UniProtKB/Swiss-Prot annotation, chain A:
Region of interest (Disordered), ranges: 383-433
Record's protein name: Pescadillo homolog
Function: Component of the NOP7 complex, which is required for maturation of the 25S and 5.8S ribosomal RNAs and formation of the 60S ribosome.
Molecular function GO terms recorded: ribonucleoprotein complex binding; RNA binding
Location (main, coarse): nucleus
Domain of life of the native organism: Eukaryota
HAMAP family in the record: Pescadillo
A GO biological process held by the record: maturation of 5.8S rRNA from tricistronic rRNA transcript (SSU-rRNA, 5.8S rRNA, LSU-rRNA)
UniProt keyword Cell cycle, yes or no: no
InterPro entries from the UniProt entry: BRCT_dom, BRCT_dom_sf, PES
UniProtKB/Swiss-Prot annotation, chain B:
Source species: Schizosaccharomyces pombe (strain 972 / ATCC 24843)
Keywords, comma-separated and alphabetical: Nucleus, Phosphoprotein, Repeat, Ribosome biogenesis, rRNA processing, WD repeat
One cellular component term from this protein's GO annotations in UniProt: nucleus
Top-level division of the source organism's lineage: Eukaryota
Protein name per its UniProtKB record: Ribosome biogenesis protein erb1
UniProtKB/Swiss-Prot annotation, chain C:
Biological role stated in the UniProt entry: Component of the ribosome, a large ribonucleoprotein complex responsible for the synthesis of proteins in the cell. The small ribosomal subunit (SSU) binds messenger RNAs (mRNAs) and translates the encoded message by selecting cognate aminoacyl-transfer RNA (tRNA) molecules. The large subunit (LSU) contains the ribosomal catalytic site termed the peptidyl transferase center (PTC), which catalyzes the formation of peptide bonds, thereby polymerizing the amino acids delivered by tRNAs into a polypeptide chain.
Miscellaneous field: There are 3 genes for uL30 in S.pombe.
Places the protein is found: Cytoplasm; Nucleus, Nucleolus
Molecular function via GO: RNA binding; structural constituent of ribosome
GO cellular component, as recorded: cytosolic large ribosomal subunit; nucleolus; preribosome; preribosome, large subunit precursor
Species name: Schizosaccharomyces pombe (strain 972 / ATCC 24843) (Fission yeast)
Protein name per its UniProtKB record: Large ribosomal subunit protein uL30A
Assembly and binders: Component of the small ribosomal subunit (SSU). Mature yeast ribosomes consist of a small (40S) and a large (60S) subunit. The 40S small subunit contains 1 molecule of ribosomal RNA (18S rRNA) and at least 33 different proteins. The large 60S subunit contains 3 rRNA molecules (25S, 5.8S and 5S rRNA) and at least 46 different proteins.
UniProt family annotation: Belongs to the universal ribosomal protein uL30 family.
Predominant cellular place of this UniProt entry's protein: cytoplasm
UniProtKB/Swiss-Prot annotation, chain D:
Domain of life: Eukaryota
Family under the similarity heading: Belongs to the eukaryotic ribosomal protein eL8 family.
Record text on subunit structure and interactions: Component of the large ribosomal subunit (LSU). Mature yeast ribosomes consist of a small (40S) and a large (60S) subunit. The 40S small subunit contains 1 molecule of ribosomal RNA (18S rRNA) and at least 33 different proteins. The large 60S subunit contains 3 rRNA molecules (25S, 5.8S and 5S rRNA) and at least 46 different proteins.
Summary of the function given for this chain in its UniProt record: Component of the ribosome, a large ribonucleoprotein complex responsible for the synthesis of proteins in the cell. The small ribosomal subunit (SSU) binds messenger RNAs (mRNAs) and translates the encoded message by selecting cognate aminoacyl-transfer RNA (tRNA) molecules. The large subunit (LSU) contains the ribosomal catalytic site termed the peptidyl transferase center (PTC), which catalyzes the formation of peptide bonds, thereby polymerizing the amino acids delivered by tRNAs into a polypeptide chain.
Gene: rpl8
Biological process (GO), any one: maturation of LSU-rRNA
UniProt entry keywords in alphabetical sequence: Cytoplasm, Phosphoprotein, Ribonucleoprotein, Ribosomal protein
Subcellular location: Cytoplasm
Protein's name in the database: Large ribosomal subunit protein eL8
Any single Gene Ontology cellular-component annotation: preribosome
Keyword Transferase included in the entry's annotation: no
GO MF annotation, one: structural constituent of ribosome
Length: 433, 396, 235, 206
RNA sequence: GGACAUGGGUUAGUCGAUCCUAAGAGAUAGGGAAGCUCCGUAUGAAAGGCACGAUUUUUCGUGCCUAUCGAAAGGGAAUCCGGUUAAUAUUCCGGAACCAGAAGGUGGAAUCAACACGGCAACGUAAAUGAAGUUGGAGACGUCGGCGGGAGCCCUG
RNA sequence: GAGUUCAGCGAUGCUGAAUCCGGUGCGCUCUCGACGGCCCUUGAAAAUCCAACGGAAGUU
RNA sequence: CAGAAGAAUCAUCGAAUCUUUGAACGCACUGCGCCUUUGGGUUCUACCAAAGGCAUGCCUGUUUGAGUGUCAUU
């Protein structure tokens, strides 16, 4: 055998740079990124980047050759090519002034289904259910954003439908576990088939687009997530026996009935079972209906919050009347007036809280995180030296890598955070007394 | 656990849910999450299953082995400049120290008295090995004086004289000078042979004659090196058999004077070697280095250092091994002296046990200079530390 | 198993330099594209449209002082569809009175005789109908901006609404929505606080991006219930 | 520098047809209808585009269903195309307006057309590009278009267009079309060839 | 008998070929020729690459640089000793090495003073990142004579 | 511990020893270093390997 | 001859198999490559094997282009 040349095997063969992957696949940078979104293809760093880059030291991103080799035989890439042919045929038809041919082209516009992409990305429904938290967070984020040029109006409608169908399933199966009102939004936490599903739902407010994000990238993610949730929701409804998709009540949807439009016709989960809650016109109905109905509680709301209100403000069957407004001119009786934090603490702790302590115009006891687990010593709101010095001063270098160095991070942040909040209790007690 | 009304820290506190604004950055965070899912390189590690870093260290049992020099109690003061070098007589009662002031002070260890104030820059000073001949060889520039203070008994002065009574030889408040030796270069380090007949002088500036061997019985000097290569930092004699150790800038070379040959070359792996010390067993060498590194060499283990130690924040100045007790010390410009327990077994399979014992502090730093020289008391675990402030510390 | 998501291969430095370079190329182009030539047909076309409007205004005002005043609703939604150069000064003034001084501006108005007369005057330029609850909520929740200190500020938090309209028992966006839908006592104050919406037509389809003079097929005049569909396309 | 051979051929052909003396029947195709009148002509043409194959299929199926289930039409109106067909229409004196492409590659295909239209008293114009004519009739290229019949609505639009083509194409040029084209010389080129000519005339005759 | 018949016999990462080029040949581009075919080898050939990028109106922009055959004697990574067969040995057996490529790991070394120190110097050392782009060296170079060194052989106590 | 040569003793094994110290020469064979001429004809190419200038990039 | 027992060195013949070559086709004429997929191992970023591909001219269509070639675009 001749002298084997350098850089012909090993890391230099296993890894491929982004620009070489572009030339290998004959794709544009945007097209290569899109299939990496649709499939799972992400950069990888070799241990020896200089060796993996044929001796070069220039900054470079690497992929597996086997990952790019898998993209060679991917049917959707031809759909991207078929779209470019389409896009040019439409331009010629519009350039030559043929409106009816262009309309026929637009009707027959090439499409693709992520059927095979979902299956090969997630072999099992358990694998899918694990990686749903990002899908739900993105879908719920876009179900409230205004329609713009970058994002499809029908795409927005798909987000609203898929999010509502998922919420309906969790309500029906009573899979909700925890609900956390953070400054970011409402962190929900359900368990489906043993998997812990946590997603955040933002508040409905008239924000502005940041104008610094690339909605092209978030368009591909949204397209993939909509396909994933459609197939996930289809199985979940079939497992429960419900037909998918649930029928649409267009009039009620146009009357802002929300979840009431979506009829779920068949084809401590009882914490609020014996309670008829009522919602005033100052509270997040989109969140309060979900949490209460997830535990069996009946919910009525102000008509301005939406149509389909089973109850009414005059109906005395109301037991609790959520009203975050600091004033009620319509103060009833037997309808104990509380605030939403009373509700959300009830789901998180699974125990009815103090109505008076959460009554109108209260001090609002602190909101706990149902996700934060108590640390070794972190404060939950609800002779020796001559031996220790040697014990910590010998192996400070009597080793080789001195991997003991991670105490300098681990013990620091843990202890100072413990010392800081163990000090806050001391300060707050002093202020009280 | 940061929300409308959190007690954990004070983000922001909101009196009511209605007042809670819209998080403007939520779109940006989800965008960055999407960016990470396809642009962030992913590496799969072992997660280093929960394992507090304190499991990794070994057990010293320092209490079980406690000849530790505790905080200093005897303070010798009076020297107005940096004490360049100091040494303790074989008896251990007299401490001869000298510095840039040119003042030679002989101190009584048990009392701290300066009985010999007579001065007569002091590069270094080393006592003779023979108790009956208490002669102190003191180097100033290129001149070395063999001083026998009249503090010793008269017969001991005579027992010093008859030992002797390249480098040229020549034969005051008790200025008992015996044989002045002048050399081409400024002598830096002094070493005494075990029998006292040979004195080794090392100078870094010189090349051909950097190291000189002086035979007192013949009253002559010569260069044992036919051709010397590299600068010489320090010189010492092997404590068991006739070898001469040359600590060069980068190496440590063992020279057999009887056969006039080379025995071993130790690669310190260090940019600059400061000083060397030899265990009385003769098979262990400790190298103090300007690279803030202490290298332990086992002559029977490897040419490479057996251990590397880098506690010091500044260049390591001197390293001294206690002649009897299994303890050694390192002094650096940081002002801190490190006392280590180094215990040696004669068994081949038995690796010598080296552990730290103490980090002696509270020493002054002058002109970015801290501890210059350290000496071990011949009897017990007492350390003589010479600082740049003119202070001598008794670490008992 | 221990996955680590390292820092992205994005090179944020050259990323934002490329951003600033793109913006600099934009301001240069906008300053460059000045003073196009105009052909005689456009001047005649403008005149014929102006006389077309003059004939319509005289007919609508004189001998036709009757307006149908869409009923069974106290609220109307009006959006400025079109606009013409050298617009008649009467039309120009009525548009600013309705606060529709710019194209794609949308305003909630009270269904009464006074608005209907002005709305009939400016009929060819405006599309109006009956907004339902879903449209009113979505418009406020997504495209509602308040005039705070006299600037256009997003109604992201109820704190600004409480500060700006607390004296009228208005503390929240839902209070704004209830006032607007039911035409409450403070409907006049709420509408003045609300900045006019900007419902620019959305061109997502490739055909929409290419065709000329695209405006989503926005017709003019009274549409009734169809404006909810138009709102649904924008929100 | 190294241009590709086909690019050099295209550019040399462009200059060569400029420098060479061009016979008047070929030089007439360098003078085309002005932009305003061409735009008005194509506005009338686009009202009489022939039905696309898809539109034709839709209409015929609509009649087929009536015949199949249960069952008088007016004559169609459209622009006339095809070289042989238009030539027969001019020779039959049925053409009201002939629109000749200015860049028919074998120029012999339409080199005789302006004279034939002149002999028959047919209003004609030479308009920019075969592809504009092609787009009207849903083809890639049309060497020539003819208007023979319009609807009574558009009699005045055609009459105004015919008058404009008379004033802006035939009243203009006329003397221009009768002259040999070409000989168009660059500013510094004419001086340079003068230096070449005088040097040649000195002693370079053989 | 080197005949006839019957069987056996050639073992390699390191030895050659394999790889490179030489004078030359030669397909391709083109052009001749009725034609078998001839001329032509960077020739008026669109003569093939590399990097950059939050994705770019989810239709790719920007920048940079621009055949083959022909040498078992030329150029070239790396193996030695002892033993072994009826016949094979730098190949097999025993022992001892070497070269080339490949990944991680262990230990050591350098850095929030950004990529090591020392010596006047020639330069040294266990390490001590170097993209595009630009160079330099080895390969790699006539012949003759004398002198010096070493090895083997020869001479000899 | 191999090989060779001597002695033996008993499948070809086992056991002894020695295998040393020199001197050298216009010697022969091969190679290297340092010169000195003659050149003129100032003395193949490529694969392959190395280095330099250059400064992109960058408690964990 | 031995051996075997729908036999057959049978006939017919419509299913197949059909090594290396040759117009002879990845490039050369003991060899040397490239691309795709799959597999093995007592060792898995390495090595190996297998299968399927890679000649020239021309035609039809497809896709992607180039042109200071001919134009249009208020």
């Amino acid at each position: 055998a001749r002298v084997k040349q350098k850089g012909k095997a090993g890391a230099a063969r296993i890894y491929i740079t982004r620009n070489q992957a572009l030339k290998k696949l004959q794709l544009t940078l945007a097209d290569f990124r899109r299939i990496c979104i649709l499939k799972g293809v992400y950069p990888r760093e070799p241990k020896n980047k200089k060796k993996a880059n044929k001796g070069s030291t220039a900054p470079v991103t690497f992929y597996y050759t086997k990952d790019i080799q898998y993209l060679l035989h991917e049917p959707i890439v031809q759909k991207f090519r078929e779209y470019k042919v389409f896009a040019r045929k439409l331009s010629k038809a519009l350039g030559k002034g043929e409106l009816e041919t262009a309309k026929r082209l637009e009707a027959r516009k090439p499409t693709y289904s992520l059927d095979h992409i979902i299956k090969e990305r997630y072999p099992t429904f358990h694998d899918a259910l694990k990686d749903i938290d990002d899908a739900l967070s993105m879908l719920f984020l876009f179900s409230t954003m205004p329609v713009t040029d970058k994002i499809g109006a029908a795409t927005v409608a798909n987000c609203e439908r898929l999010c509502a169908e998922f919420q309906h399933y969790v309500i029906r199966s009573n899979s909700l576990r925890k609900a956390f009102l953070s400054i970011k939004g409402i962190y929900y936490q359900a368990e489906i088939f043993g998997e812990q599903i946590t997603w955040i739902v933002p508040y409905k407010f008239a924000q502005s687009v940041p104008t610094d994000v690339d909605f092209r990238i978030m368009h591909t993610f949204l397209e993939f997530y909509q396909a994933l949730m459609g197939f996930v929701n289809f199985k979940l409804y079939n497992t429960l026996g419900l037909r998918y998709p649930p029928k649409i009540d267009v009039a009620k949807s146009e009357s802002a009935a929300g979840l009431a439009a979506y009829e779920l016709e068949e084809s401590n989960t009882s914490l609020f079972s014996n309670f008829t809650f009522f919602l005033s016109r100052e509270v997040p109905r989109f969140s309060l209906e979900f949490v209460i109905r997830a535990f069996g509680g009946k919910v009525g709301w102000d008509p301005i919050l939406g149509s389909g209100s089973p109850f009414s403000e005059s109906d005395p069957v109301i037991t609790h009347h959520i009203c975050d407004r600091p004033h009620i001119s319509q103060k009833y009786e037997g309808r104990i007036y509380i605030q939403p934090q009373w509700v959300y603490d009830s789901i998180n702790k699974g125990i009815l809280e103090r109505t008076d302590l959460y009554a109108c115009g209260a001090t609002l006891p602190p909101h706990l995180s149902p996700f934060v687990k108590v640390g070794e010593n972190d404060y939950d709101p609800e002779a020796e030296e001559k031996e220790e010095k040697e014990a910590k001063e010998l192996s400070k270098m009597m080793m080789s890598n001195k991997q003991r160095k991670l105490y300098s991070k681990l013990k620091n942040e843990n202890s100072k955070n413990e010392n800081y909040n163990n000090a806050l209790r001391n300060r707050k007690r002093d202020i009280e007394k | 656990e940061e929300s409308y009304n959190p007690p954990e820290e004070y983000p922001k506190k909101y009196k009511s849910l209605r007042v809670v604004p819209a998080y403007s950055n939520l779109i940006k965070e989800k965008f960055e999450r999407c960016l990470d899912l396809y642009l962030a390189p992913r590496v799969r590690r072992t997660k280093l299953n929960i394992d507090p870093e304190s499991l990794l260290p070994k057990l010293p049992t320092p209490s079980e082995l406690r000849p530790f020099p505790t905080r200093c109690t005897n303070v010798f003061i009076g020297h107005k400049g940096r004490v360049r070098c100091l040494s303790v007589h074989v008896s251990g009662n007299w401490l001869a120290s000298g510095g840039d002031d040119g003042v030679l002070r002989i101190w009584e260890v048990m009392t701290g008295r300066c009985v010999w104030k007579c001065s007569l820059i002091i590069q270094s000073l080393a006592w003779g090995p023979l108790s009956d001949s208490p002669v102190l060889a003191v180097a100033v520039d290129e001149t070395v004086y063999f001083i026998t203070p009249p503090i010793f008994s008269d017969e001991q002065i005579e027992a010093s004289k008859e030992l002797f009574t390249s480098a040229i030889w020549r034969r005051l408040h008790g200025g008992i000078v015996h044989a002045t030796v002048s050399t081409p270069s400024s002598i830096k380090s002094l070493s005494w042979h075990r029998r006292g007949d040979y004195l080794a002088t090392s100078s870094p500036t010189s090349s051909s004659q950097a190291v000189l061997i002086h035979q007192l019985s013949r009253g002559a000097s010569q260069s044992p090196f036919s051709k010397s290569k590299g600068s010489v930092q320090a010189v010492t004699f092997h404590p068991t058999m006739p070898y001469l150790l040359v600590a060069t800038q980068r190496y440590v070379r063992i020279y057999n004077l009887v056969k006039q040959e080379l025995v071993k070359t130790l690669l310190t792996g260090v940019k600059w070697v400061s000083s060397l010390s030899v265990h009385s067993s003769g098979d262990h060498v400790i190298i103090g280095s300007y690279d803030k590194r202490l290298c332990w060499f086992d002559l029977d283990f490897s040419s490479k250092p057996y251990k590397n130690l880098r506690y010091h924040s500044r260049a390591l100045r001197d390293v001294s091994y206690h002649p009897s007790l299994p303890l050694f010390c390192s002094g650096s410009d940081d002002g801190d002296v490190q006392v280590f327990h180094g215990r040696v077994y004669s068994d081949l399979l038995a690796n010598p046990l080296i552990v730290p014992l103490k980090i002696l502090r509270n020493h002054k730093v002058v002109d970015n200079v801290g501890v210059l020289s350290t000496c071990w008391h011949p009897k017990e675990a007492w350390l003589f530390s010479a600082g740049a402030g003119g202070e001598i510390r008794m670490w008992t | 198993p221990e996955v680590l998501l390292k820092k992205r291969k994005v090179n944020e430095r050259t990323r934002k330099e490329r951003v600033e370079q793109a913006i600099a190329k934009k301001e240069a182009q906008k300053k460059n594209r000045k003073e196009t030539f105009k052909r005689a047909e456009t001047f005649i076309n403008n005149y014929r449209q102006r006389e077309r409007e003059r004939i319509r205004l005289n007919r609508s005002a004189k001998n036709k002082g009757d307006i149908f005043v869409p009923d069974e609703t106290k609220l109307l939604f009006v959006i400025r569809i079109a606009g013409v150069k050298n617009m008649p000064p009467k039309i120009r003034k009525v548009l600013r009175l309705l606060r529709l001084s710019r194209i794609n501006n949308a305003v909630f108005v009270r269904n009464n005789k006074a608005v209907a007369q002005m709305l009939r005057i400016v009929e060819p330029y405006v599309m109006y109908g009956i907004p339902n609850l879903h449209s009113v909520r979505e418009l406020i929740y997504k495209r509602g901006f308040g005039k705070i200190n006299g600037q256009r500020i997003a109604l992201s938090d109820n704190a600004l609404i409480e500060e700006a309209l607390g004296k009228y028992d208005v503390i929240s966006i839902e209070d704004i929505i209830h006032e607007i839908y039911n035409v409450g006592s403070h409907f006049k104050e709420v509408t003045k606080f609300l900045w006019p919406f900007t419902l620019t037509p959305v061109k997502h389809s490739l055909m929409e991006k290419k065709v000329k003079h695209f405006n989503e097929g926005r017709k003019a005049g009274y549409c009734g219930e169809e404006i909810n569909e138009l709102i649904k396309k924008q929100v | 520098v190294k241009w590709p051979e086909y690019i050099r051929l295209q550019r040399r052909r462009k200059i060569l047809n400029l420098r060479l003396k061009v016979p008047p029947a070929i030089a007439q195709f360098q003078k085309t209808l002005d932009k305003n009148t061409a735009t008005q002509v194509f506005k009338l043409l686009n009202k009489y585009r022939p039905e696309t194959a898809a539109e034709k299929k839709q209409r015929l199926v609509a009649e087929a269903e009536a015949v199949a289930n249960g069952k008088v039409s007016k004559k169609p109106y459209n622009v006339k195309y095809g070289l042989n067909h238009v030539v027969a229409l001019i020779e039959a004196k049925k053409a009201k307006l002939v629109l000749i492409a200015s860049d028919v590659d074998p120029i012999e295909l339409v080199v005789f057309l302006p004279a034939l239209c002149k002999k028959m008293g047919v209003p004609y114009a030479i308009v920019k590009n075969k592809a504009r004519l092609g787009t009207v009739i849903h083809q890639k290229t049309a060497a020539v278009l003819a208007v023979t019949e319009v609807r009574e609505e558009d009699k005045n639009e055609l009459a105004s267009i015919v008058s404009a083509v008379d004033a802006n194409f035939s009243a203009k040029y006329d003397e221009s079309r009768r002259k040999w084209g070409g000989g168009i010389m660059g500013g510094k080129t004419q001086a340079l060839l003068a230096k070449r000519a005088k040097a040649a005339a000195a002693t370079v005759r053989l």
